[PDB]
């Protein structure tokens, strides 16, 4: 038989990284979902598009919604 050690330290950032790319890693650049419950992390150079014409300011959108939120728009009240 084998064993398995599990138990991280409470002194670490509980990041989610619900990015689309599929990668569950973190870097020195990410956008948090406006939603309180969601508060998911999503790489900047993944969902956010490049600013060819703008090439700068304004900076990242203060009001951004992940793929889980951006998709949830319709009421679907049945
Ligand atoms: Zn990503
Ligand atoms: Zn969200």
């Amino acid at each position: 038989g084998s064993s398995g050690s599990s138990g991280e330290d409470p002194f670490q950032p509980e990041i989610k990284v619900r990015c689309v790319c599929g990668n569950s890693l973190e870097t020195d650049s990410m956008i948090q979902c406006e939603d309180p419950r969601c508060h998911v992390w999503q790489h900047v150079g993944c969902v956010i598009l490049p600013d060819k014409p703008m090439d700068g300011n304004p900076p990242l959108p203060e009001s951004f919604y992940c793929e889980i939120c951006r998709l949830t728009s319709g009421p679907s009240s049945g």
Side-chain angles (χ1 to χ4, degrees), residues 51 54-62:
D51 275 281
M54 277 163 239
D55 205 338
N57 42 84
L60 59 88
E62 77 279 57

Side-chain angles (χ1 to χ4, degrees), residues 33-35 38-40 64-70 72:
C33 194
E34 294 313 84
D35 201 80
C38 207
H39 270 162
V40 297
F64 166 92
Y65 277 122
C66 70
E67 69 270 73
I68 298 94
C69 285
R70 71 89 153 181
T72 49

